[PDB]
Amino acid sequence: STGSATTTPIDSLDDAYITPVQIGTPAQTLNLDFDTGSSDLWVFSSETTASEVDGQTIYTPSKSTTAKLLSGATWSISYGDGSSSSGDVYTDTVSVGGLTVTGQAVESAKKVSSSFTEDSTIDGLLGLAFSTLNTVSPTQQKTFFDNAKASLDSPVFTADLGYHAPGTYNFGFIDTTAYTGSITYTAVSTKQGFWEWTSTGYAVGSGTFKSTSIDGIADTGTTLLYLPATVVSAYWAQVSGAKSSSSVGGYVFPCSATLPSFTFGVGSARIVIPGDYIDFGPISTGSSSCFGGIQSSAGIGINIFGDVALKAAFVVFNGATTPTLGFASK
Ligand SMILES: CC(C)c1nc(CN(C)C(=O)N[C@H](C(=O)N[C@@H](Cc2ccccc2)C[C@H](O)[C@H](Cc2ccccc2)NC(=O)OCc2cncs2)C(C)C)cs1
């Protein structure tokens, strides 16, 4: 089997991407944020505290003839930005782009933090990291991909995120028409539960490539590219007037600037992030100070290849016995 679904930016900055997911019988379609940096499939639901729901579409398990309470199971997750959610669990039929998993754990939120409430476009998360990070207790649950894998034509999924445009998530096959050149594969460590890999270096603009190992995670659920402070300083030093603002919480630059590209290495191959991808717009409405899309990871404790990086590539998440990651230009 295979599945193929379009993923759509939630706003004009590509802050996140949402993908329609069918849950239950008859189907309830929710728009989920596919996240290769976490491993819980959780949704806004009929159980979510009413004051914490503001415009999202909800899952109502009582309206699904295939929903079954997963008795005694609870979940609770805390994310890198301080956001969180928690609740109870149902198993139900879940389909993505024509690929169906029966018996998928659907984590129903009873509570969500303010950042989720305030985003009416995201109806929940679909985690695509390793199932060892799933938070359901006392019986840990598998991700949608892990449950589907043995049925897929190939044990893979791909992320092809668009710049100011929709993209695609494919399950079980590699669309050889979706990229240029060849795919370069690189080793993954699963020891922390993430798609954790090592970039071989970077370049800023037309500058020389610096060979240096940069460990980090391929993370579709984070908007920006978070790298060591050394790398980030070398980038922004090429932009007149850019500076790190403690008040704003990172690097800002004059909205009048034209930004240089940023290249990262994948083995001997190179992925080029165009300058325009690094512009996240005014820090507040009407400001002439713009927010940078490359920021320091210091204090996060991990480097994060978020959407700014991934959307410059066709990315293969290879869930073979020894997982690997592939990157191609497109
Ligand atoms: C316009 C508005 C709606 C939006 N702003 C954003 C930008 N934001 C907030 C982020 O990128 N926030 C990032 C974040 O926490 N992302 C998260 C939550 C999230 C989900 C959906 C939408 C938005 C956020 C999702 C990410 O995959 C992070 C990556 C990570 C991993 C380890 C350590 C630190 C970080 N995953 C986790 O935090 O997983 C932690 C886990 C805990 N237990 C099991 S896994 C930070 C790391 C920067 C997106 S949409």
Side-chain angles (χ1 to χ4, degrees), residues 210-222:
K210 177 72 168 160
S211 293
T212 181
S213 296
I214 308 169
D215 291 347
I217 65 171
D219 183 16
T220 58
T222 288

mmCIF file with all atom_site columns, all heavy atoms in Angstrom, residues 210-222:
data_model
loop_
_atom_site.group_PDB
_atom_site.id
_atom_site.type_symbol
_atom_site.label_atom_id
_atom_site.label_alt_id
_atom_site.label_comp_id
_atom_site.label_asym_id
_atom_site.label_entity_id
_atom_site.label_seq_id
_atom_site.pdbx_PDB_ins_code
_atom_site.Cartn_x
_atom_site.Cartn_y
_atom_site.Cartn_z
_atom_site.occupancy
_atom_site.B_iso_or_equiv
_atom_site.pdbx_formal_charge
_atom_site.auth_seq_id
_atom_site.auth_comp_id
_atom_site.auth_asym_id
_atom_site.auth_atom_id
_atom_site.pdbx_PDB_model_num
ATOM 1  N N   . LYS A 1 210 ? 32.329 25.528 4.888  1.00 0.00 ? 210 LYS A N   1
ATOM 2  C CA  . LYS A 1 210 ? 33.034 25.098 6.087  1.00 0.00 ? 210 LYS A CA  1
ATOM 3  C C   . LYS A 1 210 ? 32.686 23.683 6.436  1.00 0.00 ? 210 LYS A C   1
ATOM 4  O O   . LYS A 1 210 ? 31.512 23.384 6.737  1.00 0.00 ? 210 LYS A O   1
ATOM 5  C CB  . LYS A 1 210 ? 32.582 26.080 7.200  1.00 0.00 ? 210 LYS A CB  1
ATOM 6  C CG  . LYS A 1 210 ? 33.178 25.724 8.532  1.00 0.00 ? 210 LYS A CG  1
ATOM 7  C CD  . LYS A 1 210 ? 34.637 25.993 8.693  1.00 0.00 ? 210 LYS A CD  1
ATOM 8  C CE  . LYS A 1 210 ? 35.105 25.869 10.162 1.00 0.00 ? 210 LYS A CE  1
ATOM 9  N NZ  . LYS A 1 210 ? 36.594 25.665 10.194 1.00 0.00 ? 210 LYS A NZ  1
ATOM 10 N N   . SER A 1 211 ? 33.671 22.798 6.377  1.00 0.00 ? 211 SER A N   1
ATOM 11 C CA  . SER A 1 211 ? 33.447 21.419 6.768  1.00 0.00 ? 211 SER A CA  1
ATOM 12 C C   . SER A 1 211 ? 33.471 21.269 8.285  1.00 0.00 ? 211 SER A C   1
ATOM 13 O O   . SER A 1 211 ? 34.481 21.501 8.946  1.00 0.00 ? 211 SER A O   1
ATOM 14 C CB  . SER A 1 211 ? 34.488 20.501 6.107  1.00 0.00 ? 211 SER A CB  1
ATOM 15 O OG  . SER A 1 211 ? 34.282 20.464 4.703  1.00 0.00 ? 211 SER A OG  1
ATOM 16 N N   . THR A 1 212 ? 32.355 20.860 8.854  1.00 0.00 ? 212 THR A N   1
ATOM 17 C CA  . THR A 1 212 ? 32.202 20.753 10.289 1.00 0.00 ? 212 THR A CA  1
ATOM 18 C C   . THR A 1 212 ? 30.957 19.907 10.540 1.00 0.00 ? 212 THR A C   1
ATOM 19 O O   . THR A 1 212 ? 29.953 20.080 9.857  1.00 0.00 ? 212 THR A O   1
ATOM 20 C CB  . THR A 1 212 ? 32.117 22.134 10.972 1.00 0.00 ? 212 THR A CB  1
ATOM 21 O OG1 . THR A 1 212 ? 31.992 21.949 12.372 1.00 0.00 ? 212 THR A OG1 1
ATOM 22 C CG2 . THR A 1 212 ? 30.909 22.963 10.573 1.00 0.00 ? 212 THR A CG2 1
ATOM 23 N N   . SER A 1 213 ? 31.014 18.999 11.487 1.00 0.00 ? 213 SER A N   1
ATOM 24 C CA  . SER A 1 213 ? 29.906 18.117 11.816 1.00 0.00 ? 213 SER A CA  1
ATOM 25 C C   . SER A 1 213 ? 28.891 18.837 12.702 1.00 0.00 ? 213 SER A C   1
ATOM 26 O O   . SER A 1 213 ? 29.219 19.362 13.767 1.00 0.00 ? 213 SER A O   1
ATOM 27 C CB  . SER A 1 213 ? 30.408 16.919 12.587 1.00 0.00 ? 213 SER A CB  1
ATOM 28 O OG  . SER A 1 213 ? 31.286 16.139 11.771 1.00 0.00 ? 213 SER A OG  1
ATOM 29 N N   . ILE A 1 214 ? 27.646 18.862 12.252 1.00 0.00 ? 214 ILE A N   1
ATOM 30 C CA  . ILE A 1 214 ? 26.550 19.479 12.993 1.00 0.00 ? 214 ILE A CA  1
ATOM 31 C C   . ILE A 1 214 ? 25.424 18.471 13.201 1.00 0.00 ? 214 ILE A C   1
ATOM 32 O O   . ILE A 1 214 ? 24.680 18.143 12.273 1.00 0.00 ? 214 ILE A O   1
ATOM 33 C CB  . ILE A 1 214 ? 25.988 20.737 12.301 1.00 0.00 ? 214 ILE A CB  1
ATOM 34 C CG1 . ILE A 1 214 ? 27.097 21.730 11.964 1.00 0.00 ? 214 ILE A CG1 1
ATOM 35 C CG2 . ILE A 1 214 ? 24.907 21.329 13.160 1.00 0.00 ? 214 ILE A CG2 1
ATOM 36 C CD1 . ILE A 1 214 ? 26.666 22.868 11.064 1.00 0.00 ? 214 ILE A CD1 1
ATOM 37 N N   . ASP A 1 215 ? 25.323 17.921 14.410 1.00 0.00 ? 215 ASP A N   1
ATOM 38 C CA  . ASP A 1 215 ? 24.283 16.962 14.734 1.00 0.00 ? 215 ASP A CA  1
ATOM 39 C C   . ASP A 1 215 ? 22.952 17.668 14.902 1.00 0.00 ? 215 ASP A C   1
ATOM 40 O O   . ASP A 1 215 ? 22.936 18.730 15.516 1.00 0.00 ? 215 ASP A O   1
ATOM 41 C CB  . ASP A 1 215 ? 24.640 16.324 16.082 1.00 0.00 ? 215 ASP A CB  1
ATOM 42 C CG  . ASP A 1 215 ? 25.859 15.413 16.067 1.00 0.00 ? 215 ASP A CG  1
ATOM 43 O OD1 . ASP A 1 215 ? 26.380 15.007 15.012 1.00 0.00 ? 215 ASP A OD1 1
ATOM 44 O OD2 . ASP A 1 215 ? 26.264 15.126 17.213 1.00 0.00 ? 215 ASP A OD2 1
ATOM 45 N N   . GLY A 1 216 ? 21.860 17.138 14.405 1.00 0.00 ? 216 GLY A N   1
ATOM 46 C CA  . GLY A 1 216 ? 20.587 17.765 14.660 1.00 0.00 ? 216 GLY A CA  1
ATOM 47 C C   . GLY A 1 216 ? 19.438 16.860 14.230 1.00 0.00 ? 216 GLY A C   1
ATOM 48 O O   . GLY A 1 216 ? 19.692 15.763 13.732 1.00 0.00 ? 216 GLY A O   1
ATOM 49 N N   . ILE A 1 217 ? 18.210 17.352 14.443 1.00 0.00 ? 217 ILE A N   1
ATOM 50 C CA  . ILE A 1 217 ? 17.056 16.528 14.095 1.00 0.00 ? 217 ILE A CA  1
ATOM 51 C C   . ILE A 1 217 ? 16.315 17.089 12.895 1.00 0.00 ? 217 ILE A C   1
ATOM 52 O O   . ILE A 1 217 ? 16.188 18.309 12.754 1.00 0.00 ? 217 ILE A O   1
ATOM 53 C CB  . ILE A 1 217 ? 16.136 16.360 15.320 1.00 0.00 ? 217 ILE A CB  1
ATOM 54 C CG1 . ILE A 1 217 ? 15.496 17.660 15.814 1.00 0.00 ? 217 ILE A CG1 1
ATOM 55 C CG2 . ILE A 1 217 ? 16.865 15.646 16.453 1.00 0.00 ? 217 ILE A CG2 1
ATOM 56 C CD1 . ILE A 1 217 ? 14.439 17.444 16.873 1.00 0.00 ? 217 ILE A CD1 1
ATOM 57 N N   . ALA A 1 218 ? 15.850 16.216 12.016 1.00 0.00 ? 218 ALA A N   1
ATOM 58 C CA  . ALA A 1 218 ? 14.969 16.614 10.919 1.00 0.00 ? 218 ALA A CA  1
ATOM 59 C C   . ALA A 1 218 ? 13.538 16.725 11.471 1.00 0.00 ? 218 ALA A C   1
ATOM 60 O O   . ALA A 1 218 ? 12.974 15.684 11.876 1.00 0.00 ? 218 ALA A O   1
ATOM 61 C CB  . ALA A 1 218 ? 15.092 15.631 9.792  1.00 0.00 ? 218 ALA A CB  1
ATOM 62 N N   . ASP A 1 219 ? 12.983 17.928 11.554 1.00 0.00 ? 219 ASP A N   1
ATOM 63 C CA  . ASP A 1 219 ? 11.838 18.247 12.391 1.00 0.00 ? 219 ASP A CA  1
ATOM 64 C C   . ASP A 1 219 ? 10.789 19.094 11.670 1.00 0.00 ? 219 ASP A C   1
ATOM 65 O O   . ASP A 1 219 ? 10.867 20.307 11.650 1.00 0.00 ? 219 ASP A O   1
ATOM 66 C CB  . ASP A 1 219 ? 12.315 18.933 13.667 1.00 0.00 ? 219 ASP A CB  1
ATOM 67 C CG  . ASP A 1 219 ? 11.200 19.236 14.640 1.00 0.00 ? 219 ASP A CG  1
ATOM 68 O OD1 . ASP A 1 219 ? 10.108 18.659 14.493 1.00 0.00 ? 219 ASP A OD1 1
ATOM 69 O OD2 . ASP A 1 219 ? 11.492 20.065 15.532 1.00 0.00 ? 219 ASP A OD2 1
ATOM 70 N N   . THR A 1 220 ? 9.788  18.423 11.053 1.00 0.00 ? 220 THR A N   1
ATOM 71 C CA  . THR A 1 220 ? 8.777  19.178 10.302 1.00 0.00 ? 220 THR A CA  1
ATOM 72 C C   . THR A 1 220 ? 7.862  20.001 11.214 1.00 0.00 ? 220 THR A C   1
ATOM 73 O O   . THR A 1 220 ? 7.209  20.893 10.693 1.00 0.00 ? 220 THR A O   1
ATOM 74 C CB  . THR A 1 220 ? 7.932  18.246 9.438  1.00 0.00 ? 220 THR A CB  1
ATOM 75 O OG1 . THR A 1 220 ? 7.307  17.287 10.252 1.00 0.00 ? 220 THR A OG1 1
ATOM 76 C CG2 . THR A 1 220 ? 8.758  17.476 8.400  1.00 0.00 ? 220 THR A CG2 1
ATOM 77 N N   . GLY A 1 221 ? 7.834  19.714 12.513 1.00 0.00 ? 221 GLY A N   1
ATOM 78 C CA  . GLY A 1 221 ? 6.981  20.435 13.437 1.00 0.00 ? 221 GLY A CA  1
ATOM 79 C C   . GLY A 1 221 ? 7.596  21.681 14.067 1.00 0.00 ? 221 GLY A C   1
ATOM 80 O O   . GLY A 1 221 ? 6.998  22.236 14.984 1.00 0.00 ? 221 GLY A O   1
ATOM 81 N N   . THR A 1 222 ? 8.734  22.135 13.592 1.00 0.00 ? 222 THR A N   1
ATOM 82 C CA  . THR A 1 222 ? 9.379  23.376 13.974 1.00 0.00 ? 222 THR A CA  1
ATOM 83 C C   . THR A 1 222 ? 9.587  24.233 12.742 1.00 0.00 ? 222 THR A C   1
ATOM 84 O O   . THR A 1 222 ? 10.010 23.777 11.702 1.00 0.00 ? 222 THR A O   1
ATOM 85 C CB  . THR A 1 222 ? 10.732 23.079 14.637 1.00 0.00 ? 222 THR A CB  1
ATOM 86 O OG1 . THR A 1 222 ? 10.498 22.514 15.940 1.00 0.00 ? 222 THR A OG1 1
ATOM 87 C CG2 . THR A 1 222 ? 11.552 24.330 14.868 1.00 0.00 ? 222 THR A CG2 1
#
